[PDB]
Amino acid sequence: GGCPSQCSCRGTTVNCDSRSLASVPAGIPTDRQNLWLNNNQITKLEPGVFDSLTALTFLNVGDNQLSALPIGVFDRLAQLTRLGLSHNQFTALPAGVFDKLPKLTHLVLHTNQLKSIPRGAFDNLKSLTHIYLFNNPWDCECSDILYLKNWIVQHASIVNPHPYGGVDNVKCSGTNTPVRAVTEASTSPSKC
Numbered sequence: 001g002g003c004p005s006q007c008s009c010r011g012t013t014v015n016c017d018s019r020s021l022a023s024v025p026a027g028i029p030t031d032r033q034n035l036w037l038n039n040n041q042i043t044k045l046e047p048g049v050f051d052s053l054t055a056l057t058f059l060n061v062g063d064n065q066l067s068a069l070p071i072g073v074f075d076r077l078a079q080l081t082r083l084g085l086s087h088n089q090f091t092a093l094p095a096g097v098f099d100k101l102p103k104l105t106h107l108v109l110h111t112n113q114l115k116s117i118p119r120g121a122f123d124n125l126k127s128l129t130h131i132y133l134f135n136n137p138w139d140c141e142c143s144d145i146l147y148l149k150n151w152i153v154q155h156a157s158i159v160n161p162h163p164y165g166g167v168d169n170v171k172c173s174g175t176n177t178p179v180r181a182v183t184e185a186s187t188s189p190s191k192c
């Protein structure tokens, strides 16, 4: 039940933000619900890093230096409602990474290096009310963009809700035109 040496704990919250950390601290108590890991220098999460924190409802890992996530890294976080991943350098997300987050209402992916989202990545996010996708270099010439294009069109009111610019603030790299307007004929699997 003890609070990790580098962090401070209050109620169900574990505060590990702004602590110059390179890794998630060991020994976070398993009953804690809100975990702040933002504003550190975490460059890589090890697989399974969060597996014991089955009560988490809030997880913020924004403003770190992550380029990828391990397969399954959120799979045990059944209660998660808010997931902050902004201000990293993710170049891709793993297939299936959000499949086990049925209570997730907020997903913050803005300010990264994402070029597309894998087909079906949001299939099981049946509670999602806010997703932030702006400030990513979306690759609109590659046909892999078509899942995201069709998903944001369908669910326009949940994408970048005010004041974050709406569905139109999901922009193609280079041309800076809206992802929602990409035509299938303008894409190709050979430019991926």
Ligand SMILES: [Mg+2]
Binding pocket: 096, 119, 120, 121, 123
């Ligand atoms: Mg799938």
